[PDB]
Every structure is written in C-alpha cells, then in structure tokens.
Amino acid sequence: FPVVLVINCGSSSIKFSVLDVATCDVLMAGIADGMENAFLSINDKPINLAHSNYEDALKAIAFELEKRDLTDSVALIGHRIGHGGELFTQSVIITDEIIDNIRRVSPLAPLHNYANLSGIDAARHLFPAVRQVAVFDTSFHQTLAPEAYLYGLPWEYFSSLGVRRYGFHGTSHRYVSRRAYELLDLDEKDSGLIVAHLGNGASICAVRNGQSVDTSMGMTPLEGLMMGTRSGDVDFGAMAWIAKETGQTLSDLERVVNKESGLLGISGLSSDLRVLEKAWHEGHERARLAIKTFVHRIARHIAGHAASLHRLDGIIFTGGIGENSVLIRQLVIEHLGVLGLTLDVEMNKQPNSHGERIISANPSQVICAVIPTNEEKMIALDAIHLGNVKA
Amino acid sequence: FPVVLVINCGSSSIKFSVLDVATCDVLMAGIADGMENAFLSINDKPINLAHSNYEDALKAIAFELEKRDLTDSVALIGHRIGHGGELFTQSVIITDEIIDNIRRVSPLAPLHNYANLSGIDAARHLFPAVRQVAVFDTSFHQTLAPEAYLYGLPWEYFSSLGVRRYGFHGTSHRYVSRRAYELLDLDEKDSGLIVAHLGNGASICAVRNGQSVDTSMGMTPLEGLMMGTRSGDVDFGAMAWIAKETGQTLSDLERVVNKESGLLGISGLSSDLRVLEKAWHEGHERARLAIKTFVHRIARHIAGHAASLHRLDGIIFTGGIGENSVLIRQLVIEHLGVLGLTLDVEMNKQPNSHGERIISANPSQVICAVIPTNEEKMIALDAIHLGNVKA
Ligand SMILES: Nc1ncnc2c1ncn2[C@@H]1O[C@H](COP(=O)(O)OP(=O)(O)NP(=O)(O)O)[C@@H](O)[C@H]1O
Numbered sequence: 181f182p183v184v185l186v187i188n189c190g191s192s193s194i195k196f197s198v199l200d201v202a203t204c205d206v207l208m209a210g211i212a213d214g215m216e217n218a219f220l221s222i223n224d225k226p227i228n229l230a231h232s233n234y235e236d237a238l239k240a241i242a243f244e245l246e247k248r249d250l251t252d253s254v255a256l257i258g259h260r261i262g263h264g265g266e267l268f269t270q271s272v273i274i275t276d277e278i279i280d281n282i283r284r285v286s287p288l289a290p291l292h293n294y295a296n297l298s299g300i301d302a303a304r305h306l307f308p309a310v311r312q313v314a315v316f317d318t319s320f321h322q323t324l325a326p327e328a329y330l331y332g333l334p335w336e337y338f339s340s341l342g343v344r345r346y347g348f349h350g351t352s353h354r355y356v357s358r359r360a361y362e363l364l365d366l367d368e369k370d371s372g373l374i375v376a377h378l379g380n381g382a383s384i385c386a387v388r389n390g391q392s393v394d395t396s397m398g399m400t401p402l403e404g405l406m407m408g409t410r411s412g413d414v415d416f417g418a419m420a421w422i423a424k425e426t427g428q429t430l431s432d433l434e435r436v437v438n439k440e441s442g443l444l445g446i447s448g449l450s451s452d453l454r455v456l457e458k459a460w461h462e463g464h465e466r467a468r469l470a471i472k473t474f475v476h477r478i479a480r481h482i483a484g485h486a487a488s489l490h491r492l493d494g495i496i497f498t499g500g501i502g503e504n505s506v507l508i509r510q511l512v513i514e515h516l517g518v519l520g521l522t523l524d525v526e527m528n529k530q531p532n533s534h535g536e537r538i539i540s541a542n543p544s545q546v547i548c549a550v551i552p553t554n555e556e557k558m559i560a561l562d563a564i565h566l567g568n569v570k571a
Numbered sequence: 572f573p574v575v576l577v578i579n580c581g582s583s584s585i586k587f588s589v590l591d592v593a594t595c596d597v598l599m600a601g602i603a604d605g606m607e608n609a610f611l612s613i614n615d616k617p618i619n620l621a622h623s624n625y626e627d628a629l630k631a632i633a634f635e636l637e638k639r640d641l642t643d644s645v646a647l648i649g650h651r652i653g654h655g656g657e658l659f660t661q662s663v664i665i666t667d668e669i670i671d672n673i674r675r676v677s678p679l680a681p682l683h684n685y686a687n688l689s690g691i692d693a694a695r696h697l698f699p700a701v702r703q704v705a706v707f708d709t710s711f712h713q714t715l716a717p718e719a720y721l722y723g724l725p726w727e728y729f730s731s732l733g734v735r736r737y738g739f740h741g742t743s744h745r746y747v748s749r750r751a752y753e754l755l756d757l758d759e760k761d762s763g764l765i766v767a768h769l770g771n772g773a774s775i776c777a778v779r780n781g782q783s784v785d786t787s788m789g790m791t792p793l794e795g796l797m798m799g800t801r802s803g804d805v806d807f808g809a810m811a812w813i814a815k816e817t818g819q820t821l822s823d824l825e826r827v828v829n830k831e832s833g834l835l836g837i838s839g840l841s842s843d844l845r846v847l848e849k850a851w852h853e854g855h856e857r858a859r860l861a862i863k864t865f866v867h868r869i870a871r872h873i874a875g876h877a878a879s880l881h882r883l884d885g886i887i888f889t890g891g892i893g894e895n896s897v898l899i900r901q902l903v904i905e906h907l908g909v910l911g912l913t914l915d916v917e918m919n920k921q922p923n924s925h926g927e928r929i930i931s932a933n934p935s936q937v938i939c940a941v942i943p944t945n946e947e948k949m950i951a952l953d954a955i956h957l958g959n960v961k962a
C-alpha cells in the first residue's frame with residue numbers, strides 16, 4: 181500500500197495530505213499552521229510547535245507518519261508550487277536543475293516561492309530515497325498564445341522583466357476539465373469548456389481542445405474576478421487617482437487590493453459568502469451588492485473567455501463557492517441567458533454530496549455542471565505517472 | 572439659416588464645427604491648436620495665434636464666423652464635456668448652477684474639466700444672448716446598475732471619493748445605438764446591442780432596451796480595451812511589481828500606461844493602425860502581435876459585455892478604426908464564432924464612403940454593422956431639442 185505525500189507549503193502554513201496510490205483516497209490530512217505559536221493539526225490532536233521553521237513543521241509531520249507506520253509506504257512526494265513562470269509547462273521530477281529553475285522564478289512571487297522551496301528542502305531532507313515531484317499552479321496556462329498573455333505595456337516590460345499573464349488555479353482547471361470530458365461525454369480534442377473556479381481565490385479558464393487558451397488571473401492572483409478579499413480588475417487610473425487623493429503609496433494600495441477588498445471590502449462584513457448570503461437574506465443591502473457585483477464580474481469573464489473557444493460545449497463550476505453555492509451558480513447562469521443557458525433548478529439545489537453533476541435542463545444550449553475540484557489528487561496522479569520514469 | 576456652434580475644448584486644442592440646424596450638415600470646421608506657438612486651422616488658412624489662452628483662440632474663432640457673416644445665425648452653442656460624474660444623466664442648458672456642478676467634478680479629471688470650463692467661460696463671453704448646452708461623455712452610462720459600476724475596493728472609496736466606473740464615448744455610443752435601431756429595424760425597447768467604438772481611444776458598450784448597461788472604460792479612460800497608446804486592463808499586482816522592480820512611482824507608471832503603451836508600446840513602432848497593418852504586411856512580428864492582442868481584447872470585451880443583455884441582436888462598429896479597418900473588423904468577428912457570427916466579406920470590404928452598412932451574411936446569428944459616429948451631430952441634436960425649452 182504505497183502512498184503519496186502531498187505538500188503545499190505556503191507563507192503561513194503547510195497543508196498536507198497522504199493519498200493511497202491505489203485509489204487516490206485521502207488517508208490522512210492536516211496542517212502545520214501559524215508558521216510565534218506554530219501548531220500541528222491532523223484533521224484530532226491540535227498539537228503545538230511554537231517558533232517552528234518549515235523544516236521543523238515537516239519533521240513533525242514526518243514523525244506523525246512514522247507514528248502510524250506510514251513512513252515506509254511513502255513512495256512519492258508531490259509539492260504544490262505557486263509559480264513556475266515560463267519555465268514549467270508540466271509537472272516534473274524534482275532534481276537540482278528543477279530547484280535552480282524554481283529559484284529563478286523567485287522574483288515573480290518572492291515569499292510564496294521561498295515557502296515552496298523551503299518545503300522542497302525540508303522534504304528532501306526527510307525523504308532522500310523518495311522520488312519527489314513539483315506541480316505548478318501556472319503550468320496549465322502555458323499554452324496561452326501571446327495575444328492572450330500580453331499586457332498592453334511597452335514590449336520591454338515583457339521581454340526584459342517577464343511581465344505577462346501567467347494565471348493560477350492551473351492544477352484545478354486541468355483536473356476539472358479532464359473530469360468534464362467524461363461527465364459531459366465530450367471528445368477532448370474537439371471541445372470548448374469554461375471552468376469557473378470559485379473559492380476565496382477565484383478565476384475563469386477557457387479550455388479549447390484540452391488546452392488552456394485564456395484565464396482571468398494575471399501576472400499575479402489579483403487580476404480578473406472580484407474575490408473574497410481581492411478587488412479583481414481595477415482601473416489603474418482609478419488606483420493612481422486614489423493614491424494622489426489619499427497620499428497612499430503603491431504598497432499601501434497593494435495591501436488594500438489584496439486584503440481589504442472584494443466581498444469583504446464592498447460588504448463591510450465578511451469575505452465569507454455564507455455569511456453574506458445570510459446577511460442579504462436579512463436585508464443587508466451592501467451584502468447583496470457585494471454578491472451581485474461578484475456575480476456580475478463572473479458572468480462578464482465567463483462570456484469573455486468564451487470568445488477564445490470555437491464552440492462552447494460546457495460551463496463547469498468548482499471550488500468552495502462553485503461547488504456549494506446554489507444561489508451564486510443560479511444568479512451566474514441567469515446572467516448568461518444570452519448564451520442560451522437553461523438551469524434545472526432542482527438539479528442546482530442538490531448539495532455537493534452529489535459530486536460530479538449536471539445542473540442545466542435539456543433545452544440548454546450549453547451544458548452546465550458542477551465538478552468538485554481535487555488538487556491533491558491531481559498532484560498525486562502526476563506523481564504516480566512520474567513514478568514510472570527512469571531519472 | 573440658424574446654425575449650432577459645437578465646441579470641444581480640450582487640454583491642447585479647441586475643435587469646433589458649425590452645423591446647419593436644418594440638415595445638421597457641417598458648414599465649417601476647424602481647430603485652434605498648440606494651446607507656445609498656438610494656431611487656428613479652419614479645414615485653408617493655417618493661421619497663427621502664439622501664447623493664446625482659451626478665450627483668445629475662441630475670440631479668434633468668433634471673428635472668423637463674424638468674417639463669414641455667421642455670427643447672427645448662431646442660435647445655439649454645444650459644449651462637449653469630458654466628465655459629468657454622477658451629476659449629469661442627460662445634456663443640459665448651461666446656467667450658473669450647471670457651471671457650479673461641472674466644477675464639483677473637477678477632481679475626477681482636473682485638466683480636462685478645466686479646459687471644458689475654460690471653453691464655457693470663453694463662449695459665454697463671446698455669445699451672451701445665445702443659449703448654450705453641455706453634453707457629457709459620461710452621461711449615457713449613468714443608467715449602469717451598481718453591480719456593473721462598482722469596483723471591488725473598500726466601500727469607502729465609492730461612498731466618500733466617488734470611485735466607480737463612469738465610462739466614456741457616451742455621446743458616440745448613444746448616437747450609434749440610435750442609428751442602429753433604424754438600420755437594423757429593431758424595436759428600441761426590446762433590443763440588445765454591443766457598440767464598439769474603436770478609435771485612438773476605444774471602448775465597448777452594451778445597450779439593452781436603449782440604455783447603457785455596461786461599458787469598458789472605467790473611472791478613467793484607461794480601463795478596458797487596449798488602445799493606441801493606452802494599456803487597457805492591466806493587473807494592479809503587475810503594476811505594483813513593476814514599481815518595486817524599476818523604482819518608478821505611480822505617477823511614472825501612469826504616464827507609461829496612458830502615453831507609451833498599447834499599440835505603440837507593443838509594436839515599438841506606432842499607435843496608428845494603418846502604419847501597423849502595413850508593417851505586418853511587411854513581416855513585422857511585433858506589429859502583428861500588437862494587432863492580434865488588440866483584436867483579442869476587443870473580442871473578449873465584446874462577448875463579456877454581451878452578458879448584460881437578455882438577447883444579442885447586433886454588434887456595431889464605429890470610430891476611426893471601426894469604420895475604416897476592414898482587417899480589424901474581420902479578425903474581431905472571426906474571434907466571435909462562438910456567438911454565431913457570419914461575416915459577408917464583400918460587404919466588409921466596402922470603404923466607409925458606404926456609410927451605415929450591414930456586414931454580416933444572412934445565416935449570422937447576430938447582425939453586424941458599421942455605423943459612422945458623429946458626436947458633433949449628436950450634440951447639435953441635443954442643442955436643438957433643448958432650443959425649444961423655456962429656461
Ligand atoms: N455551503 C456554502 N455556500 C456558499 N459558499 C460556501 C459554502 N461552503 C464554502 N463556501 C465558500 O467557499 C469559499 C472558500 O472556498 P475555498 O475552500 O477557498 O475553495 P478553493 O477550492 O480552496 N479555492 P482557493 O481558495 O483559491 O484555493 C468561502 O466563501 C466559503 O464561504
């Protein structure tokens with residue numbers, strides 16, 4: 181019973197799951213968190229770490245698996261990498277070269293790169309005779325054409341500084357789009373999907389014949405959809421006007437746009453969609469506005485991403501919000517009557533326990549579906565495929 | 572033979588036309604320009620002004636009409652106003668109140684407001700017994716709902732500073748959409764149009780049942796489409812990353828994004844589409860990229876604006892580029908095969924001498940058309956309607 185250990189080692193946390201190689205089912209999950217009073221929390225023991233660096237938290241995690249006699253079953257380790265620039269177009273077996281290449285991306289997302297590389301260094305220490313794989317949030321989007329990835333900035337910003345759209349959630353978009361060809365019985369090589377990955381981070385992606393051809397996030401995760409706490413698309417003129425008017429700097433505004441905006445910023449209440457849905461139900465006008473705005477920007481990006489398709493066969497919702505928000509999905513879909521969508525509300529009402537599920541009624545011009553995303557499973561599948569290779 | 576004098580009094584120029592009230596035909600046009608060595612240029616006399624303020628240039632223009640015995644036929648003056656904030660939802664007869672209200676908008680576009688108000692002050696001096704009208708580039712878009720005009724910034728930026736989408740080209744979008752109901756034989760009250768106003772400034776607008784319900788420019792003219800020298804939509808994260816990396820300030824970057832970007836910035840060659848079309852024809856790769864990018868962002872915004880419509884009946888091109896670029900229109904339309912568009916290329920080939928013209932073939936799901944825009948005529952029509960009122 182070999183397992184894969186999957187690690188997502190971010191700026192404040194290390195999330196992990198242990199997946200059985202046979203079924204890709206989760207056998208254990210957890211999170212080392214607060215990385216002054218750090219602590220380890222296996223789904224049970226909410227145990228304390230305090231002043232722990234990344235190698236410490238992971239040594240702790242390794243001892244918990246040693247505990248459960250898992251250590252010798254760990255045949256593969258999969259690392260989620262936030263950003264692979266233009267250097268990674270698919271998941272790779274980690275070697276010194278791959279490490280050097282991940283380091284060259286550092287400037288594009290410095291703290292998050294640093295954390296992912298800290299997790300790699302830790303795992304390489306803790307499991308030296310285990311093959312390790314790197315899976316990148318950006319890599320699925322590397323099939324975008326230049327017309328879709330370039331900004332309208334001076335060419336120099338692109339050719340010298342690598343300013344261009346990267347996109348994120350690639351691993352979710354990819355996983356969900358593969359499940360969609362089966363659920364919808366579509367030929368992958370002749371197909372058009374829009375995937376809406378709606379979570380606290382949110383993005384759209386157009387998949388044409390199995391490849392990503394447009395996506396809503398940009399060089400960073402701040403572009404595109406309005407999100408929990410992120411502004412999404414915002415007029416740079418307006419941002420420069422705000423600076424002059426309030427005396428805030430780019431750095432001030434960047435924090436505002438990443439941490440105080442979005443659902444939180446409009447609502448004045450919360451980033452959490454469930455709190456906002458309940459607030460609206462109680463007459464809260466700003467919560468309703470936050471939601472309607474959220475919805476409007478989703479519909480807008482969905483239709484816009486469709487323009488990169490030759491034919492629209494499906495729209496697929498996923499993520500915390502796409503999977504669980506009955507109201508958000510219906511409002512989005514009713515905002516796309518122009519594309520010929522017809523919702524089956526009884527199907528749309530079903531909770532996420534129902535898994536991969538069609539929610540459009542028969543007369544719909546485009547199939548609409550909900551497909552639970554599973555990034556850990558995608559990473560493990562990549563790892564397992566890579567486990568057959570001679571390095 | 573009463574006439575309307577139409578004035579557009581910007582930061583460097585005063586453009587004017589004199590239109591006959593009967594036919595709305597142009598009888599005279601011109602431009603006072605360079606506002607250290609200023610000069611007056613009636614379509615003839617390229618005459619010099621030098622060190623001329625706004626009142627001087629206009630006194631010069633007034634004397635040229637006195638010259639041609641027009642002065643006493645001037646029954647109305649129409650002023651193009653760049654920005655009316657939330658205060659103006661339609662064109663108005665200018666009074667002290669209207670002047671006070673235009674001044675309150677100043678902070679939203681300080682130099683351009685100042686110029687428009689300078690032109691009002693000049694004209695009020697030069698024609699005191701003549702009714703004057705103000706027509707605002709923003710006012711057509713005041714029917715946008717909050718979900719379409721809000722940014723995902725903290726609510727305070729909207730409620731205290733008036734940060735929100737305004738949109739521009741309103742006077743063109745309005746004029747063209749009215750001509751479209753006739754050309755396409757559509758019922759205005761039951762209709763969906765997207766208008767693409769493609770010039771050196773460019774924007775999209777969705778008109779649902781005769782009202783603007785979405786538009787691509789934002790609080791300022793920098794948002795949305797990529798344009799001649801403007802970047803269009805750009806990830807604020809990327810802009811903040813660029814700042815940190817090059818040490819440029821918001822003010823530096825604002826100039827870059829307004830004056831060195833867009834077609835110019837990608838091509839490295841020109842903002843002028845005709846130069847770029849010819850460069851591409853000669854193997855210039857960056858010109859081709861500038862164009863493909865331009866086209867891709869147009870298609871994306873068109874489809875996205877469609878999401879605000881209940882039914883898409885028409886897509887209408889206008890502006891310097893929309894009216895004259897055979898290649899741009901066809902590339903855009905071929906990028907929207909997803910919406911069921913079919914181009915009649917022989918109709919698309921016709922030059923702009925052919926005026927208001929359908930360019931989609933019969934099997935097309937959406938009618939596509941070219942409608943020459945005429946902001947001066949729209950302003951004059953407003954003025955003439957307002958000429959019947961008791962103030
Ligand atoms: N039952 C629910 N109804 C509505 N929203 C929900 C529900 N459950 C969770 N969510 C929302 O999902 C969001 C969190 O989603 P999340 O777990 O982030 O999805 P994700 O797959 O993690 N995407 P990302 O956040 O970028 O990794 C919050 O707004 C939650 O309120």
Ligand SMILES: Nc1ncnc2c1ncn2[C@@H]1O[C@H](COP(=O)(O)OP(=O)(O)NP(=O)(O)O)[C@@H](O)[C@H]1O
Nearest residue numbers: 769770771772773842843844845890891892895896
């Ligand atoms: N024959 C042509 N083919 C392609 N592009 C053209 C042609 N003629 C003019 N244009 C382009 O139109 C752009 C200038 O358009 P413009 O006169 O600005 O339209 P507009 O109605 O003024 N919009 P705005 O510029 O914001 O006021 C430049 O790229 C020109 O190259």
